[PDB]
Amino acid sequence: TLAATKRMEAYNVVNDSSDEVFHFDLYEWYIEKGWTDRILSIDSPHVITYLQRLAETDFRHAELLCRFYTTRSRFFEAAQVQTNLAKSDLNISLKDRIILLSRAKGNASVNTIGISRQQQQQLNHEASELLEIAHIQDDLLERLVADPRIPEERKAEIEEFLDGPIRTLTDLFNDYADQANYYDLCLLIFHAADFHNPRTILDTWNNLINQSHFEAEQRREYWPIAEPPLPYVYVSQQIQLIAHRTSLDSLIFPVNSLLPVVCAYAINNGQDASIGADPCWPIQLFLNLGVPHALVVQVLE
Amino acid sequence: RKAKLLPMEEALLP
Amino acid sequence: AFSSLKSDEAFELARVAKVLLWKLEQFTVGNLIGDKLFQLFQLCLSAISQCSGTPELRSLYYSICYRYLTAVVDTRSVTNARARTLKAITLYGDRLLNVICDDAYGSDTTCQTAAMILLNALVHTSRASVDCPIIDALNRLNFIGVLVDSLKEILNEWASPSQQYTSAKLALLLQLCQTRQGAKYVLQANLFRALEQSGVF
Amino acid sequence: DLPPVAKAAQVVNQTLQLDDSYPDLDSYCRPGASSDYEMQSSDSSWAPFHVVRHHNIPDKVFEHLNAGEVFTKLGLFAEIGYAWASIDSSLFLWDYTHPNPELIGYEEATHTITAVALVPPKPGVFVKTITHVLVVATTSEIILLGVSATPTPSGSKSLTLYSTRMSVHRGGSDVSFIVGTKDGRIFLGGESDTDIHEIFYQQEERWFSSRCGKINHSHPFGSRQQEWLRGLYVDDTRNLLYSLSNRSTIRTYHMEGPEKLTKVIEKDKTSCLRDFAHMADSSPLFTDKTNIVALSPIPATEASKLHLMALTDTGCRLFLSATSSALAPQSMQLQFVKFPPRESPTRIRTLNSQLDKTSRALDPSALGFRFSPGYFFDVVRKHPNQDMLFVSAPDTGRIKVTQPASALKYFEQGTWIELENGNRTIEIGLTTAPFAAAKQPLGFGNELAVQFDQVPGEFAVLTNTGVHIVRRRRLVDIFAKALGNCVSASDDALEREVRKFINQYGRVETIAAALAVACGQGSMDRNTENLARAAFIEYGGQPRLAAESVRLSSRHDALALYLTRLVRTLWKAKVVQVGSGSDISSTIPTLVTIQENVERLRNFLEANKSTIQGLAPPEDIANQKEHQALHALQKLMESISEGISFVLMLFD
Amino acid sequence: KLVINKDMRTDLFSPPN
């Protein structure tokens, strides 16, 4: 149409101009009108400077710059901003930083034209690490706040410290996870920290099993809204939760030692046919978790 | 767009 | 300790091991050598699967694994080594081959050459172990497809670095046409029409 | 004596019988009247209904609507998720669930369109791919079109029209109301008179007949009076047709034969008023000045006696019985009246036993709809510009808890829904499958029994700006959201909130809801589930001996109740169907969901073996038989899981 | 990088100041 011609004639004057102070005032006005998809389509290089200079102090503008790159398929450049934004000093909630690192991990998982394979994985590894930590920090804060053992005065002091940037595993372990005797989250920290120590890893597994057995036996004794599960069932849940979440690392999930422990617990605490349980529930647990048959039989031997 | 009206032959059997 | 930390110290230590492997009571020594050569083979494939360092460092790892799979492995002792050797390759899977396939027909001149020749040793040693998982992975990664496409205009490419590169390229395709399963994937690539546009004949 | 899974199967059987004994409509709407309401703010966690989404009318018909010269009309096909608009001699359908819908137009019509409806086809006339028949009435003709609403592939039913070469002259009587029966009978009526017409249509061409005919089932002689229709209403379960006139006369017709229709009752407003006078309570809300603006038939599966509900423009619901003298009915009588609620809608919350028979909160009622098992929608036109929506449902919880039978009243939960001003309500239709908890009046209205079998009822509300979706909220939905309000709140605030549920639904029903929400049923969600779990533990009660014999805890009853409701569809059902070597009774996808639900329950029990009292091993006789009964229930679950796993293997 | 130090922490079960 000639209507469509006068449209293209008009937006060529605008997009081609060399006055970038005009472009900035134009991009600022496009947002105020909610014309989001318009900013993205612009191929001028004055838009990149505007969005980059605004991403530095506005989370919701760094959002578009990341959208700008991902519609153009510059996936690495987006994860590069999403990661550098989660590590920022900006006022961003922890659960948003979990999204950022989760998107960054995806955008840095696929090849992007021009950028190396090493720099692609160099960023995916960094983002994945932080996401694992941030998930611990989130699951930790969630449990600390709901912990009756903690004073309501301290809970506010924690929430301000945790609900924001991602802290070191050292800070998460000492001043919080280990004190509260959160044995399951202590193991996730060992895994996320590549913590080399066979004993303490095993000692923590023993405490995690016992504390789990207790919470389930107290429940069964009380029944408590629905019929609670028998002890080994809740213990089995707390291992599966680690197994999927650990991705079955040999350091914090050593079948060489842990399987005897679970089999020992199944005897010393009488989780067997007496209570209607499958006597081979320790074997059934590890096999279905992905442990090789050739190894399980090697341990029972 | 005027809806395409498929024929009676398909509609009613047999 | 520096397998994937920094790409500067490994370079000086990666080339010394390369030449050392080529310049090569006796039973005790033979076991220690073969033992470390097997351990040294793991850290190489581990770095290739993660695409660490620059293309230069990534090229040295190809030469080390090349002679290892060509001289060391190539008789009960041989079967045990060959069996366990394939296990390491299968551990990574497509993640490792994907990195090697991307190195080929790339910007660097020596990395693409070493990577192309490396694939020949993998498929060669795999057949000795009627099918093969290595050749199957190449088809899923779209490596055979792009490889047959590059056959066009071969006259332009063909001592010189470009000449030696093409030698390994055509040499690899020749190996896939020896197994029964290769004819299926290779024939579907329509190689007859690719070699005609080049007008080499 | 009896083994574990056998004892548990007994509890399940008894529990099934309990749910199927939920009071019938006749027994809590006994002769007399009621004004029993508990009103709830629209935004409350206790709201019986709420708006879930709205779909704007597509702009391309707004253009056509303003291009109208004389007549325009809107309507709903809620059962397939389509809406329609007619502009003069043109018709346009579209799927309102779709975001950028295509217009399906039909502009062959020569004269102004006055009514359109979507009806089941007559069997053995069309190819099986035709799901419906589209009846289009103009000022000149009644036109039939073939329709296929097959489900390609993601949201709504892809829709195609087929011509049929079937049309009848419209005749002298206007057509504004078209209704259809299960078996494809098509009845017509309008605003020229009270006559009811039927359209016949055939496969064959015959020399003496025609493919398509129209007859008048009424035949009047001379000596007429001005009177016309307001609506037509079908009840297939009794083969009845009801008409409502402008003088508020209710006529009942019986489809005695496959092509016969016979007037068997005519009840004018005077008769309704005489009946109403002989009731203990007369009221200014129902006089000879009052109009009946809508009817809603009550199916035979919901009630034996009460056939029909009639809505007055003052907001009174009249429930009429009908009886044979011996079958068609010959008499109709006004038995029970539900008077309007008192609370009017407010912006600011306000501070909250005799019969209230004078409320004007529903004056005037312009439109009204009732859906089984008692969902009531009233379009109140207080102002000439914006409608208020009054919506109520039976208080199922209190109704089934109430004891004895003589204490039963028509308790209700209500709320006001405001759809933002300036838009007028046109029609309200059911989008989900018709509700039914049982196949007879007893047990029919038990919403509680089916909250995991059936999708909650959804309703499309058509206005002149769009379609609003209203969803019924179940017990578990209310319980979950209420708990959501207790997360940040105190400790003894949960106890407070739980007691509200107990005082209404009863302890067992309440704990069963907590169990369900703990298992992921329900509308941070983890905090809510943990809260539900906590309630299931702390409020589940304990086993005690009566006046050997033991009374199990409410926690046990709750578990048996929840488990029973998960398997109620298949428990007494045959596993297979045989014609010569074939079918499975319960569908494959439903067995998977039933299994997943049961395995979720089992998992919750194990994952809390320690803290659920009675699960771990153990005055004593009480706690011991509690432990035995819970064990029995758990062995039944794994047996249920195995059994289903086995049937899935068979047909694999 | 993880470093356990049970020595000097902050009492998680006591308010501040």
Place this chain on the structure above:
Amino acid sequence: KPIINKVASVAENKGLFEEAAKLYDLAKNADKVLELMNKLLSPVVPQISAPQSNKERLKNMALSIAERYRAQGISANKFVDSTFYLLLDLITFFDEYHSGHIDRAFDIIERLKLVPLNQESVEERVAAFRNFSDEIRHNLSEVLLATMNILFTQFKRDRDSQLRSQARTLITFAGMIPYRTSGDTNARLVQMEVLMN
């Protein structure tokens, strides 16, 4: 039962999967039938189903094995079995996508709950990808792009906010998932989301 497995076993060792399936299916060994049927389908999931193609000739045998395995209530372990019926759904997702039935194809992918569309589901969907058969993770790249291109097309035809929100969801999922061709895919996904705004 043994020889049919013996004959099926060698033909399996000779990469003759399409035969080993027919043979294993002759002995009603669904553990192996569905295993092999998973391998023959994954390569052909995103391909174009055209008359006499290798997709039709494999899809049509897989469906003839789905009916006979449901009518007779047969099934392998849930891992092998879940993947087998999952691929069959995806094969339907691309057959509808390649035909232009965008609305219908969008509905299918939504049921599978494989790709998150609301930000709340990202955490759980991401965890599920870890233990799903690699025959599925392989085709994740083409699924994200088709789903994106689906939303992409529907955008050019409030609703705009809803598509925009879903567009974002796919990106963050892909960002947190390490998979095939994550480089080219994650980039294209981001570009298509920018054009929407």
